Symmetry: D2
Subunit: 114 residues, 4 copies
């Protein structure tokens, strides 16, 4: 079980954001590059298990990219945000981090969970 | 499994809202009196199982009252909201309804989930 | 200007929550019943000027009820929430209190502003 | 007056996010480049006037970067998010766009205003 999870909730329709692409990155501490770790597609419950193994979950800066524009477009609607990136700092590597996305066409939010 | 669930997340601290009192009511369609259905306390994950049985879960207007004033005072802080009541309409009783609360001392939000 | 303001924003459509009915109440300090202070209708910028005078804005527990179900109905859609009541405590009367509502059909939020 | 505005709210303390650095970029539609437009600091109302002139406000993709980690660090706290970037598409150049941030140490949200 991954130590990083996520959950996308469509707040306009009160349903899981199914079938959204999520790309996970870690900053290289040497150069300022973002290495891609994993790309995933949210399931019917709007989750994306297997984002990262415990072995590879080292301290550092991480970035989750949600393809919000493509998700809305596939539903036949435009989004103000073509994509959303959440950048967060991992320091204590023994905790579970939950990094969700709540989204309408014109707003979104995230909160760190456990 | 209750067809009604919740989840309290403390947004200021990024941890589950544990030990928060939650009261579920339903509106009497004859009078317009609210009646208490169940009272519970969130557990360590900020969840509150067993809010209602399947057989008691009929179409109507429901109310969840979260005891935010008392939750914050037990952490040694004040809350702008002495309590929060989420009133919601249920017509379709075969779906699952998740009615969470994201809370700091000075903000809250909720979104219907499944 | 009123020391209490609001702002309603339709997050589902990215536009001001125009023509939303808001009822302002204050808790009766003697009997803990609710007294009605005034009603208003938000303008095309989603605001509701002149909710209360400085002279009558005394310390206590206030409630703003936003008629979200009617507002959505007049947009031709259903809302999960027939209404939203935000209850909040006023102790320092010389502060400005901004109590907005950010809303879709299936979610809402509020935050204390100054 | 700038046709792009912002407002930063500290949702942990219910006050404006004052003295937060904001950097506004626009995407170059030929190469892939992000170009800086303006860097500001939020004033005491948590706003940043003069983000862009009307002349310079063209259709494209814009990014607003809020230095949330430094803001918290000057208040002696940690933030889960070292910075927050909001990427958004401008299509109608004659509208006002308000792109705020509501922020705690462990959560944030934004919603297109008008």
């Amino acid at each position: 079980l991954s130590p990083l999870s996520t959950h996308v909730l469509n707040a306009a329709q009160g349903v899981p954001g199914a079938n959204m692409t999520i790309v996970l990155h870690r900053l290289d501490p040497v150069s300022s590059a973002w290495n891609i770790l994993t790309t995933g597609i949210t399931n019917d419950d709007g989750r994306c298990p297997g984002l990262i193994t415990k072995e590879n979950f080292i301290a550092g800066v991480y970035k989750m990219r949600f393809e919000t524009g493509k998700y809305w477009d596939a539903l036949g609607e435009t989004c103000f945000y073509p994509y959303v990136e959440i950048v967060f700092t991992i320091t204590n590597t023994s905790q579970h981090y939950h990094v969700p996305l709540l989204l309408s066409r014109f707003s979104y939010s995230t909160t760190r969970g456990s």
